[PDB]
Design a binder for this molecule. Structure first.
Ligand SMILES: CCCN(CCC)C(=O)c1cc(C(=O)N/C(=C\c2ccccc2)[C@H](O)CNC(C)(C)c2cccc(OC)c2)cc(N2CCCCC2)c1
Length: 329
């Protein structure tokens, strides 16, 4: 195809990963491909933490195209912190490469045990420029500016456990990934891939909610008050002292998420947010839903939403395209 494709690998049906390389000798890494952030980083050989020793590491000395920056930098994620300095080298994604600014992480201890538990080496942000630390132009925009792709856009077709692999496609929209109408939602900020949707779940309704499409989050998140009201009398159980909700797997009262705009309507059935714990009798399940409050009431449409819906991230048109993902390729 005319486009750039990076294969997405499924990992336990909740997170997915893809590979990319740094250096002219193309040192390989496994990344969370993250529309929810906007910085690229890789752990350095100069990182000597226990976590780093389990990872693929970046050695600048083995790359002839490496150029020094050294500006100190600290990334603060919700989970925790990685710190290091900026560096510039050739970044290769699929069959395209470009000189790019990224973070060499030298310290990983403030990001444990998350980092060691996970199978990524680093994170490759895919958000907008103002979301990045150090104001780094997004890779896809740069690739567009350099006429290495036709459009400044990328698309996610998520993998499903041994049924099909997935693709991050850079440069154009491929009809093989979706069926039915492809609908566009204008961004309400050039920051996250964030759009405005009315959110209906059951008895509760929130008009014009902020919805962030986030491939770097494996849950759906919901405002805490909304989540409370959502589950009342639904035979869902809050686990004491933990943030988890648990239910019988055959619970017919489990509601379907409904997100609507003037342009389209998207729904998410229990099938996409039920996690099976033990399939004894009626079955014990856990909701893949997290209560979480932002200054503005916000839904985070993470991987479960994207597993049902093929999504298009269009820099040129400042919008998110949504369509029903094909069940198989
Ligand atoms: C199921 C286990 C896998 N996992 C964490 C282990 C790697 C997650 O999917 C996860 C990812 C993020 C996260 O920050 N994702 C991002 C990057 C990332 C960083 C480190 C590891 C993995 C991914 C995104 O960049 C964050 N996106 C934004 C900024 C919009 C955001 C902000 C605030 C909360 C949030 O999570 C929904 C997402 C946050 C969380 N939460 C949300 C509930 C409370 C506990 C922490 C979970």
């Amino acid at each position: 195809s005319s486009n750039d494709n990076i294969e997405l690998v499924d990992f336990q049906n909740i997170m997915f990963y893809g590979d990319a390389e740094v250096g002219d000798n193309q040192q390989p890494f496994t990344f969370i491909l993250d529309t929810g952030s906007a910085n690229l980083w890789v752990p350095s050989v100069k990182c000597t933490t226990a976590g780093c020793l389990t990872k693929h590491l970046y050695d600048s000395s083995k790359s002839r195209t490496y150029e020094k920056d050294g500006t100190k930098v600290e990334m603060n994620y919700v989970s925790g912190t990685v710190s290091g300095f900026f560096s510039k080298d050739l970044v290769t994604v699929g069959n395209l490469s470009l000189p790019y600014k990224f973070i060499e992480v030298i310290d990983t201890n403030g990001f444990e045990p998350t980092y060691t538990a996970s199978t990524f080496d680093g994170i490759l942000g895919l958000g907008w420029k103002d979301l990045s630390i150090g104001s780094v132009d997004p890779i896809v925009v740069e690739l567009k500016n350099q006429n290495k792709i036709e459009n400044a856009l990328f698309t996610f077709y998520l993998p499903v456990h041994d049924k099909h692999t997935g693709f991050l496609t850079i440069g154009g929209i491929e009809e093989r990934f979706y069926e039915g109408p492809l609908t566009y939602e204008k961004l309400n900020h050039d920051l996250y891939w964030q759009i405005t949707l009315d959110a209906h779940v059951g008895n509760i309704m929130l008009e014009k909610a902020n919805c962030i499409v986030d491939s770097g989050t494996s849950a759906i998140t919901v405002p805490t008050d909304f989540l409370n009201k959502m589950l009342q009398n639904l035979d869902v159980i809050k686990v004491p002292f933990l943030p988890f909700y648990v239910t019988l797997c055959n619970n017919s009262k489990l509601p379907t998420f409904e997100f609507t705009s003037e342009n389209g309507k998207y729904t998410l059935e229990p099938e996409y947010y039920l996690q099976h714990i033990e399939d004894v009798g009626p079955g014990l399940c856990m909701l893949n839903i997290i209560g979480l409050d932002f200054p503005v009431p916000t839904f985070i449409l993470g991987d479960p939403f994207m597993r049902k819906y093929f999504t298009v991230f269009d820099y040129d048109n400042h919008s998110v395209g949504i369509a029903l993902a094909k069940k198989n390729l």
